[PDB]
């Protein structure tokens, strides 16, 4: 699924994202943008041979399995596909994970590289919420 801007920005809310660990809507939408330019179905290698799976990207090394990333985690105790459903509560959930793990919303390099400091309720702007 492509997500609308404003369709993922009220997904997002139902779920709990909106100001979860002190980031405000926003961020959460301007990160899902710039890492899946909102498509659950985006996946993309790593360097490193673990891949990023769905709107947020997450990291095989540490988050889902997919069974071909040696010596990694699972620490949200799914597979990585799950990530890639229409239904966000999988992704939303792992990245409520990653986001408590101490470095915020770091985690996300395009976060860090392209929202962090910036007018990020732009991303809400005219959503019904
Ligand atoms: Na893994």
Same mark, same amino acid.
């Given at each position: 699924k492509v997500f609308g801007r404003c369709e993922?920005?009220?997904?997002?809310?139902?779920?709990?994202?909106?100001? /979860?660990? =002190? /980031? *405000?809507? =926003?961020?959460?939408?301007?990160a899902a943008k710039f890492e899946s330019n909102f498509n659950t179905q985006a996946?993309?290698?790593?360097?490193?041979? *673990?891949?990023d799976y769905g709107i947020l990207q997450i990291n095989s090394?540490?988050?889902?399995?997919?069974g071909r990333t040696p010596g990694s985690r699972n620490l949200c105790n799914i597979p990585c596909s799950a990530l890639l459903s229409s239904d966000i509560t999988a992704s939303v959930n792992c990245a409520k994970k990653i986001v408590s793990d101490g470095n915020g919303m770091n985690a996300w390099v395009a976060?860090?590289?392209?929202?962090? =400091?910036?007018?990020?309720?732009?991303?809400?702007?005219?959503?019904?919420?």
């Open positions: 993922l920005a009220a997904a997002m809310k139902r779920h709990g994202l909106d100001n /979860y660990r =002190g /980031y *405000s809507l =926003g961020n959460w939408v301007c996946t993309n290698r790593n360097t490193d041979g *673990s891949t090394r540490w988050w889902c399995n997919d976060w860090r590289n392209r929202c962090k =400091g910036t007018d990020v309720q732009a991303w809400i702007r005219g959503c019904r919420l």
